Design a protein around this ligand. Structure first.
Ligand SMILES: COc1ccc(CN2CCc3c(c(C(=O)NCc4cccc5ccccc45)nn3CCN)C2)c2ccccc12
Ligand SMILES: [Cl-]
Length: 63
């Protein structure tokens, strides 16, 4: 796996956690950026767990 794939895979496992699911999107997005994910990678992770967010929303949170 590439380092990008590891970042996204780790983000997926994070977002699936039951306590994490109850945490607001904003906090999760900030946390995922702090682990080195780009806005596009964050967006990909949310879509892969069936919790899709627009890239615009993710960028708004991080701006
Ligand atoms: C921002 O909110 C939270 C952050 C961390 C936690 C603590 N962990 C929850 C579960 C969890 C964490 C992590 C975690 O920190 N994984 C590492 C990780 C996660 C995401 C991206 C990563 C990118 C590169 C390297 C590691 C990365 N993974 N999982 C899923 C079970 N293993 C963090 C929170 C717990 C409950 C509610 C909110 C949490
Ligand atoms: Cl915030």
């Amino acid at each position: 796996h590439s380092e990008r794939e590891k970042r996204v895979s780790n983000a997926v496992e994070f977002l699936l956690d039951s306590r994490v699911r109850r945490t607001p999107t904003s906090s999760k997005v900030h946390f995922l950026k702090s682990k080195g994910l780009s806005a596009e990678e964050i967006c990909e992770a949310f879509t892969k767990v069936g919790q899709p967010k627009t890239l615009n929303e993710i960028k708004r949170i991080l701006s």
